Amino acid sequence: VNVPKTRRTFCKKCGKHQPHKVTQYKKGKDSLYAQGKRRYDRKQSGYGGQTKPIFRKKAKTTKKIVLRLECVEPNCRSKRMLAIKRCKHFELGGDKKRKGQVIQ
């Protein structure tokens, strides 16, 4: 789908409708020193093989795209996530379509 990069919407810390720069959200790097990561490293360290299950039956082909709405105001600069339904194609502010034009 197409979403714009500028969205004027509600802000948590301010309490009013303010503009937000819109970007897409991606998964961060997995920290080695998280609790479940340390637990999995200690559980895998040793003999025994693969202790925890490894998921294999991937069924669905698309993800839930997440928008990371950063506040334009320099004092606030607050961010939050916004969930939209699943879509295959996705872009940010590209080719705002017209009505009644020549298709070539």
Binding site for RNA (CB under 7 A): 1-4, 7-10, 12-13, 15-17, 25-37, 39-40, 49-64, 66, 68, 77-89, 93, 96-97, 99-100, 103-104
| Contact residues for 80 (Cβ-Cβ < 8 A; gap 6+) | 12, 69
Q: Which does 102 bind (CB under 5 to 8 A by kind): RNA, Zn ion, none?
A: none
Which position has the token pair 């990371």?
68
Residues 23-62 that bind Zn ion (CB under 5 A): none
The pair of structure tokens assigned to 96 is 């705002």
Q: How far is the CB of 33 from Zn ion (least distance, A)?
A: 32
Q: What is the DSSP letter of 59?
A: -
69 near Zn ion (CB under 5 A): no
Q: How far is the CB of 80 from RNA (least distance, A)?
A: 4
Q: DSSP strand E in 6-78: where? A: 6-10, 17-24, 66-71
Q: Which does 35 bind (CB under 5 to 8 A by kind): Zn ion, RNA, none?
A: RNA
Q: What is the DSSP letter of 45?
A: S
Q: Which residues pair with 71 in a beta bridge?
A: 20
By CB under 5 A, name the binding residues for Zn ion: 11, 14, 18, 71, 73, 76, 78
